[model samples]
Target: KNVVIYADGVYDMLHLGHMKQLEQAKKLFENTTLIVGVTSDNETKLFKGQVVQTLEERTETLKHIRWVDEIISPCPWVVTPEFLEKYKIDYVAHDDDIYAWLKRAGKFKATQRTEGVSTTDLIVRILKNY
Candidate 1:
């Protein structure tokens, strides 16, 4: 079966954790189309604090991943039903979700993060070594 899966994230530095999450999304189904959505720089600053990479940098980083079939930039921080249908997203790969439409429809699929390999953790490690 050709399953279309959507995974959205801030992807500040596009580290192993980010890749791991995408990996889960890709293999969630036997044959999957993984469209990775990236949050806009503006939203990242507003909620996720300062970023290590810009929007373009973050978007380009996902391109080299073998598991990533496509990339969507400047995706909404809070996904709506319209957005899901626009991309024909059959499942959402995320660790958390509660939006009404997806909540009722059960289209959400949980994805996990890699431990000790997040961008912030890397940042702290870099500074510690320096």
Candidate 2:
């Protein structure tokens, strides 16, 4: 059976770091199907303070990436086992400590986080330069 992998995040201000994270996830298994779950605008604002781009905008941006096989917009912040079963997800990939619980539970794997790049860094740069 083909392994269905999931990568969950709030992909605001799409950048190279996000690409690298997904790339790493894709490399974990052959014939892997990468499913990206983008959090809803309300979820992002609740946790992230604010969102510069709307959920629709983020979904549209992510859909264009060649490697992404499928996307679930307005996805839940917590990925329960039920969610995995419903989506047929075999594994999850992430680089953040927030997903450490999943890692310990053996349902997730840690991917390499792109150094020197992030949405925050990009925003800071933009504010400072332009």
Question: In model 2, where do residues sit more than 4 Å from their true spots?
Answer: 97-101, 118-130
Estimate, for each residue in 87-129, the C-alpha lDDT of model 1 and write its tens digit. 9999888886255567578888888878888767877998999
Listed in order, each prediction's TM-score against the native is 0.87, 0.85
RMSD of each: 2.0, 2.5
lDDT at 50, model 1:
87
Worst 10-residue lDDT window for candidate 1 reads 95-104
Report clash pairs, candidate 2: none
Q: Report the number of the highest-TM-score candidate.
A: 1
Residues 17-100, candidate 2: write the lDDT tens digits. 889888888777878899999999887788876888999998999989877999998888988888988999988988756667
Model 1 vs truth, CA RMSD: 2.0
Per-candidate local distance difference test: 0.85, 0.85
